[PDB]
């Protein structure tokens, strides 16, 4: 049984930290593609 | 074969329909007798 309310499992990540980390990743990633490109991130597509 | 209903039919949040209350027989210590077991399963583990 559940000794209380049913709640959704979840996980929190700091928003500013993630945005800064992703910015660092793009800054380093551009070195292999060029400084006049657009780097876009998207979620996964197929599979289970 | 499991006979399942929704665990929390009045939930108006996520987890609505994610946890199912499934009835099944299952064996006991002796091969001549069966029991009746009620348990909850997550939707991802159970297919219709």
């Amino acid at each position, epitope marked *: 049984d559940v000794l209380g*309310h049913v*709640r*959704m499992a*979840h996980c929190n990540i700091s928003k500013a930290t993630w945005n800064e980390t992703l910015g660092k990743v793009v800054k380093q990633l551009r070195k292999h593609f060029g400084n006049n490109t657009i780097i876009r991130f998207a979620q996964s597509s197929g599979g289970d | 074969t499991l006979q399942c209903t929704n665990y929390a039919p*009045k939930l*108006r*949040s*996520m987890m609505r329909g994610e946890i199912k209350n499934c009835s099944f027989n299952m064996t006991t210590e002796l091969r001549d007798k069966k029991q009746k077991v009620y348990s909850l399963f997550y939707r991802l583990d159970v297919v219709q």
Partner: antibody, heavy 125, light 105 residues
């Protein structure tokens, strides 16, 4: 805190009715918003509601399909659309505010609501 | 679709009388019952939420209680502003429903 509705005073058969409600003195994200119908001489019928910060919507099994409820927090407003309006849908429509008692994550609708604390003037249709 | 009834459908009363309005649910609603007062031509206004909790701004003359399937609203002094149609709202489960209403006269 005042709620004020608007929209056409009547639509023709098979047209979509679009009603709006403005929130003045408060913020949509902290409350849930309900729409209630009252045909003339009859009692109250719940149409549906939309949450605040979660954006989730729920509809009555009556008025099956047809009903769309939405909100726009950038203008602190929300609206109701009813497609394929017929003669039986003429009524006074109200918007209303409901409180949220939060026990879990608000963005997952982990709260108890349903009480109506504030009613608008009403819009006869 | 939870059903709700009210009793009486019309209650005869004079000014200053103590009155009780009852509501009967088809199933236990765990006290998640709200009471509203509606006047002709106006939107209903709140009185009570969660069966017994009084809404802020509502005179202390209004009270109520109940459990299970049986709930009551008590008005201790029926002043002229209180001759209104009263409604029960059941929010324990969705869709939300309302009773037929009881008229005071």
């Amino acid at each position: 805190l005042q709620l004020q509705e608007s929209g056409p005073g009547l639509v023709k058969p098979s047209e979509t009715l679009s009603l709006t409600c403005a929130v003045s003195g408060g913020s949509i994200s902290d409350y849930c918003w309900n729409w209630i119908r009252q045909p003339p001489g009859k009692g109250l019928e719940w149409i549906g509601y939309i949450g605040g910060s979660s954006g989730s919507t729920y509809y009555n099994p009556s008025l099956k399909g047809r009903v769309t409820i939405s909100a726009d927090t950038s203008e602190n407003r929300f609206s109701l659309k009813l497609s394929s309006v017929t003669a039986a849908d003429t009524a006074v429509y109200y918007c209303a505010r409901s409180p949220i008692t939060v026990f879990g994550v608000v963005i997952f609708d982990e709260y108890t609501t349903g009480n109506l604390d504030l009613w608008g003037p009403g819009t006869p249709i | 679709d939870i059903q709700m009834t009210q009793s009486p459908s019309s209650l005869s009363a004079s000014v200053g009388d103590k009155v009780t309005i009852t509501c009967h649910a088809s199933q236990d609603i765990s006290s998640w019952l709200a009471w509203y007062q509606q006047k002709p031509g106006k939107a209903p206004k709140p009185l009570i939420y969660y069966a017994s909790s009084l809404q802020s701004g509502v005179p202390s003359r209004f009270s109520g209680s109940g459990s299970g399937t049986d709930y009551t609203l008590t008005i201790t002094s029926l002043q002229p502003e209180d001759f209104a149609t009263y409604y029960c709202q059941q929010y324990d489960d969705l869709p939300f429903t309302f009773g037929p209403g009881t008229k005071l006269d």
